[PDB]
């Protein structure tokens, strides 16, 4: 029958597979352990065979090459059988995590990555069941997925342990001090300053959406009240009127005196130049460009032919 729920489709393919017995988990682990030594030989041989060990078979050292491919196909089918049959354990673990940051679809795919890693590190010589050891790896891959994903401005893994450490100490101080909580008692038992605890509370805030309804209806959003990070045209127009008046008092000076003040601060070129680069294009050495600018800035401070540069002080 046709259906639209993709979670119902994946749960039907899980239930169509028969579960393994207690003796079949030991049998499949021996071929996976035989696959561990087969890939370790290839990882040791790829450093001296120009990274192309397609026909270099060190395990055999027409009938031996066909039996090597039969053992390689049967060992990869055993790792194919252990992860595929234990997919009901991933659903029983990820159903307790589908409320914090992620949906139910992304948790089974991240939990299946831990089931693959649990199949390689499963040691059947210890005697424990596969469901005991794989629970530690499915829960690890799910918790690492919320620490790395499900947040726009993401936080590191060690920061999630710092927020959980404050929540255990605040609950600890609530039992000793029943009333009147404060923020200085939490920073004393954590051995941290009072300025680092403000950084934890600011980084733990969830981001808000720009298209959320800020009212009781869908008439307005949050983006209608947020300004842009740009300058108003009132400051960009008067910046152009500043050029018409700053160059007016420069044309009344000497042509040598006007050339010093323009190239120094960055006029008519878009780049700021130092005092030594003006002295290398001229035939006059240092201590002249400084006293020319000391003379140019002295005559502009006097109240004579500079009455328009008076109300420009901001």
């Amino acid at each position: 029958p046709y259906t639209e729920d993709s979670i119902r489709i994946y749960l039907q393919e899980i239930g169509r597979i028969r579960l393994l017995r207690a003796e079949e988990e030991i049998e499949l682990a021996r071929q996976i352990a035989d696959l561990l030594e087969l890939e370790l030989i290839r990882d040791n041989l790829t450093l001296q065979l120009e990274r192309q060990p397609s026909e270099l078979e060190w395990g055999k050292q027409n009938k031996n090459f066909a039996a090597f491919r039969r053992r390689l196909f049967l060992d990869r089918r055993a790792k194919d059988k252990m992860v595929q049959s234990n997919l009901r354990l991933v659903v029983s673990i990820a159903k307790k995590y589908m409320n914090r940051g992620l949906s139910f679809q992304d948790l089974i795919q991240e939990g299946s990555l831990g089931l693959i890693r649990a199949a390689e590190k499963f040691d059947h010589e210890k005697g424990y069941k596969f469901s005991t050891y794989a629970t530690w790896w499915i829960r690890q891959a799910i918790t690492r997925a919320i620490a790395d994903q499900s947040r726009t401005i993401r936080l590191p893994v060690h920061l999630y342990e710092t927020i959980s450490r404050i929540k255990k100490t605040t609950k600890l101080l609530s039992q000793e001090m029943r009333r009147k909580p404060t923020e200085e008692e939490i920073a004393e038992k954590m051995e941290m300053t009072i300025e680092k605890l403000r950084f934890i509370a600011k980084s733990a805030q969830l981001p808000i959406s720009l298209e959320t309804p800020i009212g009781k209806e869908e008439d307005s959003r949050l983006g209608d009240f947020i300004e842009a990070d740009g300058e108003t045209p009132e400051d960009e127009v008067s910046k152009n009127l500043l050029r018409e008046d700053l160059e007016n008092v420069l044309d009344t000076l000497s042509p040598r005196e006007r050339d010093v003040l323009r190239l120094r601060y960055g006029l008519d070129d878009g780049r700021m130049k130092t005092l030594e680069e003006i002295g290398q294009i001229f035939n006059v050495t240092r201590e002249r460009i400084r006293q020319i600018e000391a003379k140019a800035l002295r005559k502009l401070r006097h109240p004579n032919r500079n009455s328009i540069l008076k109300e420009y002080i901001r």
């Binding site: 401005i153 805030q205 981001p207 298209e211």
Partner: protein, 125 residues
């Protein structure tokens, strides 16, 4: 899309005001990096088939959210704004930002009746 068309600003309280396009872009790359991870370690084919199905649903929800499958949500239980849902509606880019704009050098006030005046003349405070 360019990043200024999906702006990320910070409010006065310290929270960030993100857009719904950033949450739909992140669902594509997170399911694309998982598909490249499963195809490298020789994953079981029931996991690679399920990973490619969620990659098909992540792009289709990014283009037109709620067209084929179920509408995905975020933190709030409203519908996420996809690429097609910003041009077709009444609050889209056509009917709210192109055919009609908010103009400068404008204002409004209440009106009172002015007698002892003429036509083509209005009272302005």
């Amino acid at each position: 899309i360019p990043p200024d068309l999906r702006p990320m600003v910070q409010l006065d309280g310290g929270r960030f005001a993100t857009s719904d396009l950033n949450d739909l872009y992140r669902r594509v790359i997170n399911r694309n990096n998982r598909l490249a991870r499963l195809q490298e370690i020789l994953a079981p084919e029931i996991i690679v088939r399920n990973e490619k199905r969620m990659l098909q649903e992540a792009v289709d929800a990014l283009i037109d959210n709620g067209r084929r499958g179920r509408t995905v949500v975020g933190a709030n239980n409203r519908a996420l704004k996809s690429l097609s849902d910003i041009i077709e509606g009444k609050q889209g880019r056509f009917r709210q930002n192109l055919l009609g704009k908010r103009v400068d050098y404008s204002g409004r006030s209440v009106i009172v009746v002015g007698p002892n005046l003429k036509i083509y003349q209005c009272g302005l405070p």
